[PDB]
Amino acid sequence: WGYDDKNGPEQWSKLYPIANGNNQSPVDIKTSETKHDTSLKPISVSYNPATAKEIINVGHSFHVNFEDNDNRSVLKGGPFSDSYRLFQFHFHWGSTNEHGSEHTVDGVKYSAELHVAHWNSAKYSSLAEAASKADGLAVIGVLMKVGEANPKLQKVLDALQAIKTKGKRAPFTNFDPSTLLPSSLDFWTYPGSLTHPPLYESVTWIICKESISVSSEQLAQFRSLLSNVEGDNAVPMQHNNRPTQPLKGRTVRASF
Numbered sequence: 001w002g003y004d005d006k007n008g009p010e011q012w013s014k015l016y017p018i019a020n021g022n023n024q025s026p027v028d029i030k031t032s033e034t035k036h037d038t039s040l041k042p043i044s045v046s047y048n049p050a051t052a053k054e055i056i057n058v059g060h061s062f063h064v065n066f067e068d069n070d071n072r073s074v075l076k077g078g079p080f081s082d083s084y085r086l087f088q089f090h091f092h093w094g095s096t097n098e099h100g101s102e103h104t105v106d107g108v109k110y111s112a113e114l115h116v117a118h119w120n121s122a123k124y125s126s127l128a129e130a131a132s133k134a135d136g137l138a139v140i141g142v143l144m145k146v147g148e149a150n151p152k153l154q155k156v157l158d159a160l161q162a163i164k165t166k167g168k169r170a171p172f173t174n175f176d177p178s179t180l181l182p183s184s185l186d187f188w189t190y191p192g193s194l195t196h197p198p199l200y201e202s203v204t205w206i207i208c209k210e211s212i213s214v215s216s217e218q219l220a221q222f223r224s225l226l227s228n229v230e231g232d233n234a235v236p237m238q239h240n241n242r243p244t245q246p247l248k249g250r251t252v253r254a255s256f
Ligand SMILES: NS(=O)(=O)c1ccc(SCCO)cc1
Pocket: 115, 117, 131, 139, 193, 194, 195, 196, 197, 198, 203
């Protein structure tokens, strides 16, 4: 699987039939159709920068992984009664500034999107156990809007020169990714899925209503990552967002 014409989102269902399921992500959030819910608590994140571990070029994207052997870095509140442990963050982007986010809001596409993913350590004892469970994963999504350079992205962008090609990895330490979140954590939430294979319907989504910025030159750094292995002809990572998926009667809740 990939994002190209032959192996890309419109084709995933052949190998992963869940692609046509009832809880697929991402979605267009129609704000006239959201339900304000007063039982939602505020989102609380508390991440220890000592859990930052490694950055990895995975061919279609890059990931920053965290140690997840204990509850040093956690998400709580919102819709959740369980504590969720941070395991990774990453970004999705498009070929031009005009699209690239996964979630859209009233049809509006943003240039990129940040995902901060966690797993339910109250109920399960590893990512691998949690990942396919309906209550197993919690992902914060932040829409990234093209504009002024975002200096909080610095350490991440400066790391990419060490992982230019597929499979490269390097230590990435002492970093707290709550520094990337917008100053307001007002959110929407809905039950959904991983946005790429294996597409498990295991994710409770927390989508920030406030965007964070990114510059056109910062987006170019993502797009200049290479999907080929060292020594091969360069194939830039132009894009890696999945199209929005039908709600199938799900309700998006608003914390605000
Ligand atoms: N874009 S996403 O849905 O937040 C995501 C997070 C983590 C993973 S790894 C799960 C493999 O079991 C895949 C997708």
